[PDB]
Amino acid sequence: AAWPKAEDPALVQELLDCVQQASHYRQLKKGANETTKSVNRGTSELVILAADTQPLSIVLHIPLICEEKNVPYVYVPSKVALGRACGVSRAVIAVSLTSNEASDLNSKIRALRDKVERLA
Amino acid sequence: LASELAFDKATYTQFRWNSGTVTSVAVCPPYAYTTTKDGYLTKWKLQDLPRPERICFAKADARKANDKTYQGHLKAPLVVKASQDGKFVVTGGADKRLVVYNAADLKPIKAFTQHRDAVTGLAFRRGTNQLYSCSKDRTVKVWSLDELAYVETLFGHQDEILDIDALGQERCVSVGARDRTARYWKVPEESQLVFRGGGEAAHEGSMDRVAMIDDDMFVTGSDNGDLALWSIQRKKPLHVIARAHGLEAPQPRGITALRTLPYSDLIFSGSWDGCIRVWRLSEDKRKLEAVGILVRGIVNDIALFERGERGRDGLCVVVVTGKEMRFGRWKYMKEGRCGAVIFEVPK
RNA sequence: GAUCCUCGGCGCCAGUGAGGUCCAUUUACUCUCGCUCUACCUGCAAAGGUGGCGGUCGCGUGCCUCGUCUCGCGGCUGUAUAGA
Numbered sequence: 001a002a003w004p005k006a007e008d009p010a011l012v013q014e015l016l017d018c019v020q021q022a023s024h025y026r027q028l029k030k031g032a033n034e035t036t037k038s039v040n041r042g043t044s045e046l047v048i049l050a051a052d053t054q055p056l057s058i059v060l061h062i063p064l065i066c067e068e069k070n071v072p073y074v075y076v077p078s079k080v081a082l083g084r085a086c087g088v089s090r091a092v093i094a095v096s097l098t099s100n101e102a103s104d105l106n107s108k109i110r111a112l113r114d115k116v117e118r119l120a
Numbered sequence: 121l122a123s124e125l126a127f128d129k130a131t132y133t134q135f136r137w138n139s140g141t142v143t144s145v146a147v148c149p150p151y152a153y154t155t156t157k158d159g160y161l162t163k164w165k166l167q168d169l170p171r172p173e174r175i176c177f178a179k180a181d182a183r184k185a186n187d188k189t190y191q192g193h194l195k196a197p198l199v200v201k202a203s204q205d206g207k208f209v210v211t212g213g214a215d216k217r218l219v220v221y222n223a224a225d226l227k228p229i230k231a232f233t234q235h236r237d238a239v240t241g242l243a244f245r246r247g248t249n250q251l252y253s254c255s256k257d258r259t260v261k262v263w264s265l266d267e268l269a270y271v272e273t274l275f276g277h278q279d280e281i282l283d284i285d286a287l288g289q290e291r292c293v294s295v296g297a298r299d300r301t302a303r304y305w306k307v308p309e310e311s312q313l314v315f316r317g318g319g320e321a322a323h324e325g326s327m328d329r330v331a332m333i334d335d336d337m338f339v340t341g342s343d344n345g346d347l348a349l350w351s352i353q354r355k356k357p358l359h360v361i362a363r364a365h366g367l368e369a370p371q372p373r374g375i376t377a378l379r380t381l382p383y384s385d386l387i388f389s390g391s392w393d394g395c396i397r398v399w400r401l402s403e404d405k406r407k408l409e410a411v412g413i414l415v416r417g418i419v420n421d422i423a424l425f426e427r428g429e430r431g432r433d434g435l436c437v438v439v440v441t442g443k444e445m446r447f448g449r450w451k452y453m454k455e456g457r458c459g460a461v462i463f464e465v466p467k
Numbered sequence: 468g469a470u471c472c473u474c475g476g477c478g479c480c481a482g483u484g485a486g487g488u489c490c491a492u493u494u495a496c497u498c499u500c501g502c503u504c505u506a507c508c509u510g511c512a513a514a515g516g517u518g519g520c521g522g523u524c525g526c527g528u529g530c531c532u533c534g535u536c537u538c539g540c541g542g543c544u545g546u547a548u549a550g551a
Contacts (some may be wrong), residue, residue, distance in 0.1 A: 008322050016325065020279075034484070066467060078371060080450045081325050081343075085298075087280075088485085089448025133551095138495055159490095170548070175493065226492095 016085035035096040050079035122400040135146035142458040146202040150307015212239025246288035329378035343374030365391035390419030417441030
């Protein structure tokens with residue numbers, strides 16, 4: 001069910017790096033429930049999930065509402081890599097990252113979901 | 121002294137105790153220390169070959185005072201490393217702090233609070249109590265432990281720092297957390313010599329552990345199973361070897377422990393695969409072959425010994441596994457405890 | 468087909484997002500292995516007096532070597548790697 005699977009040749013790495021930079025700019029909603037709140041409230045600019053979920057059904061619900069809100073989603077293959085990409089000390093299973101009016105981070109979100117649009 | 125040791129005859133020992141969480145190790149030849157997330161810094165004892173268990177410990181206190189340098193901590197320590205003489209013990213952690221004090225009765229006298237996130241790595245200079253303390257505010261500070269005074273801060277870390285190794289000269293090899301960069305400190309002239317990786321079946325997300333074999337080259341371990349030697353002479357890697365602890369759609373398991381023998385060619389690298397993995401530097405001193413495989417749980421930290429006498433035949437080395445990883449509990453396993461697998465290499 | 472109020476009885480109650488539990492210095496819990504004194508006993512168990520192997524001082528010194536090694540009696544009290 002991971003048909004937007006991100007490729008380990010550095011697209012995963014740019015995803016997790018932009019996760020970390022958004023974590024340092026506090027633009028980051030972590031975990032599946034808070035990701036779901038950000039997508040349902042429409043604050044979300046991009047959303048990554050983790051395909052290393054042991055039952056992946058517990059994150060399969062957010063591609064629905066991301067298709068409804070028309071925000072790009074993409075899966076990285078490790079919730080541990082996403083977890084310390086956030087800086088959490090636990091495994092983050094699905095992360096959402098928003099934006100503001102003016103930031104270089106918002107530019108990096110723009111180019112990043114341009115690459116996600118090249119996937120989907 | 122790689123092939124002058126017999127890996128196939130290793131005499132191991134699996135000691136465990138109650139706290140279940142153990143994080144690091146500190147040798148004081150021979151006296152071994154540990155640090156457990158229950159809050160313990162244990163002085164335990166091993167010496168005689170032809171077995172001893174432990175003597176004493178200290179507790180991290182939930183003590184609501186402010187700028188207090190006494191015996192009270194605030195929170196559990198993370199890593200510990202002990203002096204070459206045997207006259208100072210120092211630790212630091214997510215109580216945002218160090219303490220340094222007498223190693224015999226183990227009563228904390230100085231709590232250094234100059235760092236401001238968490239003290240995530242610690243090393244010495246050999247033969248001198250010049251201390252290097254590297255911390256989660258992505259900095260590395262250097263201490264004059266002769267006065268227990270503060271010396272200098274250093275900067276250049278792109279990301280939250282992760283580990284330091286240092287030797288008898290005023291120099292360091294640090295690692296940043298995710299930035300794929302080992303960072304070679306010229307301490308007196310406060311310069312730095314940046315060695316970045318970018319291994320190119322995962323690519324290098326983070327770069328976990330570091331070890332200096334000598335004053336000319338070193339080795340770093342990344343979380344994609346890439347183990348890399350680096351010459352100080354050259355910006356490129358001296359060697360990169362891939363999938364250092366097997367796979368687990370599967371992914372290479374990352375290196376969680378690396379420590380080498382100084383002025384030697386013996387590389388000690390472990391993971392959550394359960395098997396310790398000893399490497400050697402090759403005869404060309406440029407490449408790397410397999411001196412081989414040699415328990416349960418996910419190995420956080422690892423130590424060193426030697427026979428050290430006129431003979432110098434047969435090492436001793438403990439792995440200090442634990443159930444989780446060392447700073448955060450991103451991965452949990454039922455296997456391992458607060459343990460110590462002392463395996464001794466004969467000949 | 469009246470609706471609501473009053474008086475009864477019977478039930479019953481939004482957000483956020485990374486912190487949180489114990490408290491001088493202990494030794495988790497279970498299974499196996501090894502068990503540093505022995506004997507006579509005042510002795511039913513269990514505790515004390517004494518003897519073999521001791522072990523330490525004082526002394527006689529034995530010694531084809533007058534040191535080390537074969538020993539003994541007189542004040543005392545047991546201790547080996549010791550736990551895997």
